[PDB]
Paper text:
Glycation, a non-enzymatic post-translational modification occurring on proteins, can be actively reversed via site-specific phosphorylation of the fructose-lysine moiety by FN3K kinase, to impact the cellular function of the target protein. Alternatively, the sugar moiety on glycated residues can be phosphorylated by a class of small-molecule kinases called fructosamine-3-kinases (FN3Ks), which are present in mammals, birds, and plants. Further characterization indicated that FN3K is responsible for protein deglycation by phosphorylating protein-associated fructosamines.
We mutated Asp217 to a serine residue to create extra space for the phosphate while maintaining the overall negative charge in the binding pocket. Furthermore, a serine would be too far to H-bond with the O3’ of the sugar moiety, explaining why DMF is absent in the substrate binding site in this structure.
Author numbering:
A (entry chain A), B (entry chain B): 0 to 290
């Protein structure tokens, strides 16, 4: 029984489920009332659910250490009898991001500038632990060169999965041509490692009366522009978010061309997750980059 | 635009959102206070939103006609400018199902027995109209044989979608073998059509002070055992629910094997809805049935 396990693991006499079931695609979310305070619990039954949640915990702690963004405090990861795991975190009363969008834009810009301007400086792209893009674990092996890191551990990792799962000849051939072209989009620019949320789409951000809230991160040190790809692609972010952000971090030359590259990664990732519906966007984006 | 459209279609001067729900994975749900009374509104912007909501309306009315379960009254389906539709229904003050679990078990058993012992004469499996499992429309063409109906219009329909979107050969190979096994799983039993809620997972049931409440159905006449499958797999039902249910409808021979078969449909349905993470549960269940 989940409720009995939750009572034992959280050492609480009271456990009352409140609200409607969480609108999660990855996991099932339920909010519980506890003596210490309200909590939110995500349940995933896959075998490696603990690894995925531990990467999410590591991401939340890295974001919390900056003190620049409001994210739920992770509390406990519990191995579930019968496989899988549960992830307990602080419950946050949340509403859709609108009035606090401009505040979030400033916080995200500060987050991306945090590493280069701090006391101890991460001079490589990657992460100390594995984080998951959706259900797919990602290699975060440290790399000195961002185009190298993005091509190997993001684009190639996704395209290898596509070849294994779908053996799509068109993706194989287009990647062969586009792979050599990637350095052209980054020449003459200084790329600094920046701590990223990792999946900053509208579904992973919210607000309360104090301000904006972000959650469900898959963090790593990367190009700050990659973070915006999620945000622009799937909509849901007010214009003031991007306006406030780019006042502190203006669009570097070649922003729109790199945006195609970063949108490509998410199309491939959605192809591996959801199937042939994302084949045409993935291939079309590669063709536009080669045109 | 929605609030102004809602005021016009409901002919209410006042429309005050309470509870700040934002609830639902398939659709966006919000509770509004109106001159006539409080209402709950589900919004879906996909092209087939009207068909999906109309199947829900037909399902709610079929359950309400029995008088055996308390279900929200459907009110209006509104076509939205810009695509999609809104579904307005009676608002119900609801809390998570706990004390009323055993009561729901008796009501669900009575609901399933209504066709057999009531003035109901449906001697075939199916439904008079299309109902949707999530976003997926389902064929409910009447069939004399339940294993034929379930294999053709439920299992095969989902696997056809998986084949188109993922071209999963392992799913194809296991399904071809499971097709031969399906008639053996029914032990020569005569299956009686039973009116089903259709999606009785814990997130679709609740309670008030009067008793249990169920909602969001995708109804059809099928095997009564199929109803419990979703209820078991994703948890949330107290043990007293199943105890009260099976006091009125004991487990027929082969219950545990058919449960795997009915849980397979929900894993496939979650694969088509949420993606490849549900491939391993779907394939593992098929392998377990073939062992
Ligand atoms: N700490 C929290 N407190 C309250 N509600 C939360 C909390 N974390 C998440 N939620 C709710 O649960 C929903 C889903 O959360 P989350 O994005 O972490 O789930 P997921 O299934 O892991 O991911 P995804 O939905 O992005 O595929 C959020 O949109 C929000 O409504
Ligand atoms: N008639 C109602 N009155 C009040 N609240 C309701 C009503 N119907 C639904 N709700 C609330 O909205 C939540 C979601 O409702 P529902 O399950 O119908 O949404 P859906 O998005 O179509 O489906 P799902 O969440 O299963 O994917 C419920 O858990 C409940 O909290």
């Amino acid at each position: 029984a989940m409720e009995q396990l939750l009572r034992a693991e959280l050492r609480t006499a009271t456990l009352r489920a409140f609200g409607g079931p969480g609108a999660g695609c990855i996991s099932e979310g339920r909010a519980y009332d506890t003596d210490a305070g309200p909590v939110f619990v995500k349940v995933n039954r896959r075998t490696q659910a603990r690894q995925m949640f531990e990467g999410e915990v590591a991401s939340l702690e890295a974001l919390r250490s900056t003190g620049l963004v409001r994210v739920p405090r992770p509390m406990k990861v519990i191995d579930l009898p019968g496989g899988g795991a549960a992830f307990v975190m602080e419950h946050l009363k949340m509403k859709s991001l609108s009035s606090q969008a401009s505040k979030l834009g400033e916080q995200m810009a500060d987050l991306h500038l945090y590493n280069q301007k701090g006391s101890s400086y991460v001079d490589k792209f990657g992460f100390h632990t594995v984080t998951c893009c959706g259900f797919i674990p990602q290699v975060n092996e440290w790399q000195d060169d961002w185009p190298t890191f993005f091509a190997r551990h993001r684009l190639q990792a996704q395209l290898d999965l596509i070849e294994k799962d779908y053996a799509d000849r068109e993706a194989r051939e287009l990647w062969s041509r586009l792979q050599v072209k990637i350095p052209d989009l980054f020449c003459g620019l200084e790329i600094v490692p920046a701590l990223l949320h990792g999946s900053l789409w509208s579904g992973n951000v919210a607000e309360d009366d104090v301000g904006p809230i972000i959650y469900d991160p898959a963090s790593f040190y990367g190009h700050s522009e990659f973070e915006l790809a999620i945000a622009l692609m799937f909509g849901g972010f007010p214009r003031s978010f991007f306006t406030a952000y780019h006042r502190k971090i203006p669009k570097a030359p070649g922003f729109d061309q790199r945006l195609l590259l970063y949108q490509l990664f998410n199309y491939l990732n959605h192809w591996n997750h959801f199937g042939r519906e994302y084949r045409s966007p993935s291939l079309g984006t590669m063709r536009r980059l080669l045109k």
